[PDB]
Design a protein around this ligand. Sequence first.
Ligand code: HEM
Length: 154
Amino acid sequence: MVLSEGEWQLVLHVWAKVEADVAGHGQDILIRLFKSHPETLEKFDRFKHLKTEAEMKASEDLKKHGVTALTALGAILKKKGHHEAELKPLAQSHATKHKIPIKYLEFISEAIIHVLHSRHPGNFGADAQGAMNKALELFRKDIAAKYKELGYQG
Ligand code: HEM
């Protein structure tokens, strides 16, 4: 798929807001993910033991990782589709070392879209949400093709 420049602008306009507080957005997103789809939490051996949302909130490690994850996503979105180099090391660790099914990357995409909608309603109307969704579908499609080249999905 190919996003137009107008779609990329909408995606990079709300991302610039996210970057004013990367650690807070990373927290919100991972928690949303773990509350919604608790099975995803089992993939994290470092966090697995967290029992409540108050425990998740207070985990410094969880917050640091959310910054790591968002920063990597942010560097991929700023490429505007030319992200093959960035995608390689990420598809290799998630498919071979962590073992994250595509289905889970759909669950976090939903969590990202939920959180941006809540925090940024003015910069995340229907057209901007459709453009972010398009950018994440692209990301998933490219990641899934890489998984297949690496021997993991399908
Ligand atoms: C927006 C998509 C995602 C991005 C950009 C992302 C990015 C990253 C980055 C940059 C790291 C550290 C370096 C490495 O291990 O590759 C990481 C580690 C990890 N990721 Fe992701 N990830 C994504 C989705 C997920 C999902 C959906 C799951 C699981 C349900 C997952 C599970 C993990 C685990 C288990 C680690 C290791 C955590 C620790 O260090 O122990 N990731 N991810």
